[PDB]
Write a protein that binds this ligand. Structure first.
Ligand SMILES: COc1ccccc1C(=O)Nc1cc2c(cc1N1CCCCC1)n(C)c(=O)n2C
Length: 109
């Protein structure tokens, strides 16, 4: 049901954000500091934006939620060179966030 699902997602988002130990993915990539970001990235995403989306009832299924998480990672791997803190952090988040989502999905099913 909807209310239990939304409770699950809120907890899941909290746990995903907990894996961002560099605090690298918790606000939008700042265009004032990374001015060419939108030359390469179609749809920016970050955990604050996901929280706004969650609280506005925009994630009513697990796939839509997981897709936005996957964008946080994919965008970062795409934009940044391999030998950067950003790329390395995204690879780690993919692994550790992946684990959180697998557990959450087992709960939702
Ligand atoms: C607020 O961010 C900055 C402030 C001053 C100088 C530089 C930055 C900055 O480069 N931030 C930044 C760049 C990112 C980035 C994240 C950030 N910040 C780092 C500081 C906290 C907010 C997010 N991700 C995920 C990327 O792929 N890129 C290129």
């Amino acid at each position: 049901q909807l209310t239990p699902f939304l409770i699950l997602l809120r907890k899941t988002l909290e746990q995903l954000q907990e894996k961002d130990t560099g605090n690298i993915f918790s606000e939008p990539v700042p265009l004032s500091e990374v001015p060419d970001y939108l030359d390469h990235i179609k749809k920016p995403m970050d955990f604050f934006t996901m929280k706004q989306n969650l609280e506005a009832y925009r994630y009513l299924n697990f796939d839509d939620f997981e897709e936005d998480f996957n964008l946080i990672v994919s965008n970062c791997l795409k934009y940044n060179a391999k030998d950067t803190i950003f790329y390395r952090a995204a690879v780690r988040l993919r692994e550790q966030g992946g684990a959180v989502l697998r557990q959450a999905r087992r709960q939702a099913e």
